[PDB]
Structure formats: structure tokens, C-alpha cells
Design a protein around this ligand. Sequence first.
Ligand SMILES: C[C@@]1(c2ccc(Oc3ccccc3)cc2)OC(=O)N(Nc2ccccc2)C1=O
Lengths: 443, 54
Amino acid sequence: ATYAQTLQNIPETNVTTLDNGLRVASEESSQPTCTVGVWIGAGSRYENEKNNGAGYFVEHLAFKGTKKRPCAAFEKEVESMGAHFNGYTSREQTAFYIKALSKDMPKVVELLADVVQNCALEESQIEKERGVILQELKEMDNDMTNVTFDYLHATAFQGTALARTVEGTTENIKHLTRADLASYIDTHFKAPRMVLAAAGGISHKELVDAARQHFSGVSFTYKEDAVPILPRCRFTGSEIRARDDALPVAHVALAVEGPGWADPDNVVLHVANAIIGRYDRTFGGGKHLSSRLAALAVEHKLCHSFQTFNTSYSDTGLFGFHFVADPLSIDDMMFCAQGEWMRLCTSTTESEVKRAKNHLRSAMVAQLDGTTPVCETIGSHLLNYGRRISLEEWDSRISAVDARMVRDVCSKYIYDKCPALAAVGPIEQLLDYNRIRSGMYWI
Amino acid sequence: IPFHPYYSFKDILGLTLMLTPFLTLALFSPNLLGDPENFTPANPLVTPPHIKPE
Ligand SMILES: C[C@@]1(c2ccc(Oc3ccccc3)cc2)OC(=O)N(Nc2ccccc2)C1=O
């Protein structure tokens, strides 16, 4: 059994569309346990100034009970069957999924449908969650990494929809109405914009059957079955500096505009990010790590950690890096980090990509380690590519990448571009934008 | 802020701004500031009527 053969012998992903426009996909295995859920193409980006934080507010009630079954009843039923009910809401994507015994795939599907369609939106529960959410905002306000990424979007996409955070504003949370949440749900949780995904030991035909039975409510007009294209979010080379010398370490995030899901270049960017990789003070590897930046970080004690990223979206994305450092080592870190980015565009090696490619393969294989992670892939894939992409296709694409390709693609999105910068904490040593902007050319 | 490029650029600008009058004077009015008396070889026995410094 060779890597290739194992990739080809992986069960295919089945997809079937209902008349209402919903899509049902699943990957079959021989596991007594499974995961199934509905991936909705909704999120903060779809909200506006008045209902920002609604999709999040909803994410809080999506588990507090439906019309057919109030809170206690809803919970008991799920708990008593050993099933796990989780989910999340992001900027362009939302999800509600359940982990359970394949033996219950059908009852689950019924439960899912009931959650996405008949949420009780208990008037009293709403005021109760209003206070919970407000506490979660204070908890997250201490999460530098997330404060930093929020700020990164706040400036990189200033003036637009991606600038908003997923959780929403304090004013919105304090005044969102039972009607607003309701409106949100009806406006966005719609068949053509949803995907019923499942993985494990399940019959695609049994899945699609229960699907037909519970995901009904078809649409009449044309405006109800058309998936709205969102208005473009303008990228802006800029920076937001939130200084507080009272914080122990500083977080910095720099990024250029990314291509967006459908673009093939993304395979190259991910290889590129693989070369620079990531690091943190507990990587036993130490000073021998392959990632040059990681090596320098260790030798010069440049940071506590650093990480690259290539966040995608429908029509845009953020390609960059983030690091945490002591107030006195920020400048050298940023220096080396930008240095490496220059190296990418200019002097990438075949060896470098050979390694990065292997690293990338095992990384994609890791994101399919369990029923939930695989289910997440399916949901996301159909929702972003409108079709599942096998590990064999990815590997096909990854294999085509070479040093020259990395250089051209990287030169394309990085070289001499105006980045977006977010710095939080004791950031006095971080030099100005103009200085950083110069680190964008020559290497 | 870092001296470069803020003040390196500001300084180079200030340089060319003052360099114009300097060159204009030197190239269009070379003798505006000097005493015509200095175009006459020093004479130990005759002192100029109106000795005036730069
Ligand atoms: C250019 C000049 C000059 C430059 C700097 C000076 O300042 C001082 C330098 C040393 C000692 C005292 C003053 C003074 C004169 O040199 C010079 O010979 N003169 N001419 C002059 C004419 C009449 C009286 C006194 C001087 C200057 O103006």
C-alpha cells in the first residue's frame, strides 16, 4: 500500500441536491460513530451596522431549544443519547454539527433541521444570553491573538464588511431584538445556502432520505433560491497600533491581500507558508529547525512564538504572519520575518519546496483525522468550491509546485505591496509604517 | 520617529530650498555681497575712505 494507492482507494464523497436547493454530501467509512451537521454560508460579513453580532447571538440560542421541543427536553434528548452538540459562527461561514452513533444518523438529521428551522428564540432566553455574550466579550478582550486578528481585519478591510468582528458590537448586543434574530435566521439559514454533511458509518441514501423528510420547506419565488453575491471588501495597506506598555508581551500581525478560495494560487501560498512555517518556545527541535525564521528566533530569542497564515474567503483573503515578542525584540523579529518573506519571492530553493510540500501533504491529511474534521472539510468544500476536493487532487496540485512557482506567486502577492498591520501591547520598538513598507522590497 | 526617512527626506528638501537662493546669488549676482574695494590690490599707504566689514 503506497501513499498514492491509499489516496485513490479513499471512498468518494457523494452529493445530491434536493428540490428546495439544499445539498447533501457525505463520505462513507466503516465507523460505528459519526458526525453530521449543516454548514451554512452565513456570518458577520452578511450582517451590517445594525445587526452585527446577530449570527453570534443566534449561535447562542441554536441550542437552547426549538418549538417542537423546549430547552430541557431538547438537551435531555441529545445528552441521553451520548451525542455531542457543537458549532460555530465566523465571518463567511456558520456551522452546527453533532457527533453520535451512526445508528442515530437519522434522528440527528431531524434534530439538526429542527434547530436551523424552528429555533424557539425564547424571549426570556434572549435577555439571559445577552448577559452571557457580554461576558464572553470581556473574556475574549484578553485574548491578544484574537484581539490582534480582529484589529488586522478592522484595518485591512476598513470601511467594509470584513472589518466587523464575528461577535459584534456592545451596542448591538445590548439592543438586538427577538425580531432581529428571527429576521437573521429567515434571511440567511436557507436551503440553497446550506450543506448537510456527514462522515462515518452512514448510508448516503439513508442520509438523503431523512434529509428529504426534514429539510423540506421549498421556496416559491426566484429571490428565495438565488444565493446572493456579497459586495467586495476593499483591502487597504494600513496599520492600527493599540499600545499598552502594561501588557507583558507584544502581538504583531502583518498581511497582504489574498486571492480568495477558488484561486489555484492558494496551493502555492500554502506551500510558501510551509517553508516559513511556525514556532513557539516549546519546539524541542530548537536551533535545528528547518524554518530559517524559526532557527533565527531560537538563536536570537526573537519571539515567544510566530505563525504564518493564508486565511481565505469568497473573493479575498489575508496572507501574513503573527508573532508574540518581548517589547525589546520586536524590531529584530519583524526584520527577520520580513526578510524571509523577501527570500520567498526572491531566492526559494527546490529543497525548500520539496520539504514544504511534504509538510503540506501531511498537514492536509491531518485535517481529516476524525469524523468531525472530515465532515468540516466536506461542508466547507461544497460551500467554498461547490464540490469536494479529494486528497488525491490536492496532492496532484501540490506535486506540481516548484521553487520558481513559489517565487512568482509570492512575488505576485507580496513583493512591493502595502501591508496591513496590527500591533497590540508594548509596541514602542516597532518602527513606523514607512520603515515596514520598505521591508517589502529587495531581499 | 526614526530619523530615516522622515528627516532625511525633510533635510534633503530643506537643502534644495536653500540651495536655490545660494546658487541664484552666486550665479546671477556674484558680487552683490562683496566690497568693490577688494578688487584693488592691498596698498599699505592708502586706507579706503569707507572701511566696511562683511
Ligand atoms: C570677514 C571679516 C570678519 C569675519 C569674522 C569676524 O569675527 C571675528 C573674528 C576674529 C576676531 C574677532 C572677530 C570679523 C571680521 O574679515 C575681515 O577682514 N572683515 N573686514 C573688516 C572690515 C572692517 C573692520 C573689520 C573687519 C570682515 O568683515
